[PDB]
């Protein structure tokens, strides 16, 4: 459902 629009910035 949710995309890496939960984070993404590696780290």
């Amino acid at each position: 459902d949710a995309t890496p629009e939960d984070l993404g910035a590696r780290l």
Partner: antibody, heavy 112, light 108 residues
Framework: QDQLQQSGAELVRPGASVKLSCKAL????????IHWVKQTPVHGLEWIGG????????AYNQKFKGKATLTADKSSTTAFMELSSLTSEDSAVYYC?????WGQGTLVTVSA | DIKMTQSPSSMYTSLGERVTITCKAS??????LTWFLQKPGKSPKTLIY???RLMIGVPSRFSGSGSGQTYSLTISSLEYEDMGIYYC?????????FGAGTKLDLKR
């Protein structure tokens, strides 16, 4: 699917260490960061840090830099958090999260 | 460190009632916020991600809004299943930060 399953309760002695695990199921492990959160009656919720299984990148709460170590293992789609020099102040429930999904948590009790 | 000021801290409510909870970021967080609920002795359950997106499986009586520093979680009609503590989480920038949460309680 959408799931994070955490290792069982831990009963550990002061000065010792523990390594907690967080199995990821239902999504692509190397596409999302996995984070760990501490929760205690007295201190509430506290972000510890995160790891990106894909790039292996990490970010820690300054407060845990040197106390907690985050690692991830691609082949078993499992994130890990190791805590050293346990001290009762570390007795708490620990959660791994993807920010949307949350593990069921792991109870850690530091006692002699 | 972004500070999330959440309010009210305590909610005295009735079933069927409409409920609004608020989180104010000490700075712009660009809708990178989640609203989750936690019941006694249970693990957190996310209701909303990215300020206004419904978590799959979550009932539509839940909705979020806001855009800069002010975000709100609204429960159109309170149900018994909804009792517990609500929390907001900002993840726009490290360290991840939480609101102090608001306790929902049935009035009488």
């Amino acid at each position: 699917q959408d799931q994070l399953q955490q290792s069982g309760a831990e009963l550990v002695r002061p000065g010792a260490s523990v390594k907690l695990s967080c199995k990821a199921l239902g999504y692509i492990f190397t596409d999302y960061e996995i984070h760990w959160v501490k929760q205690t009656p007295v201190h509430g919720l506290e972000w510890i840090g995160g790891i990106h299984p894909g790039s292996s990148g990490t970010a820690y709460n300054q407060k845990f830099k040197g106390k907690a170590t985050l690692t991830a293992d691609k082949s078993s789609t499992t994130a890990f958090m190791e805590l050293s020099s346990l001290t009762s102040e570390d007795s708490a429930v620990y959660y791994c999260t993807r920010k949307d999904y949350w593990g069921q948590g792991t109870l850690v009790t530091v006692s002699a | 460190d972004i500070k999330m000021t959440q309010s009210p801290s305590s909610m005295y409510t009735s079933l069927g009632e409409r409920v609004t909870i608020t989180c104010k970021a000490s700075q712009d967080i660009n809708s990178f916020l989640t609203w989750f609920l936690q019941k006694p002795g249970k693990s957190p359950k996310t209701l909303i991600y990215r300020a206004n997106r419904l978590m799959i499986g979550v009932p539509s009586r839940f909705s979020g809004s806001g855009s800069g520093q002010t975000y709100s979680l609204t429960i159109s009609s309170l149900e018994y299943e909804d009792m517990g503590i609500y929390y907001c989480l900002q993840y726009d920038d490290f360290p991840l930060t939480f609101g102090a949460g608001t306790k929902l309680d049935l009035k009488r």
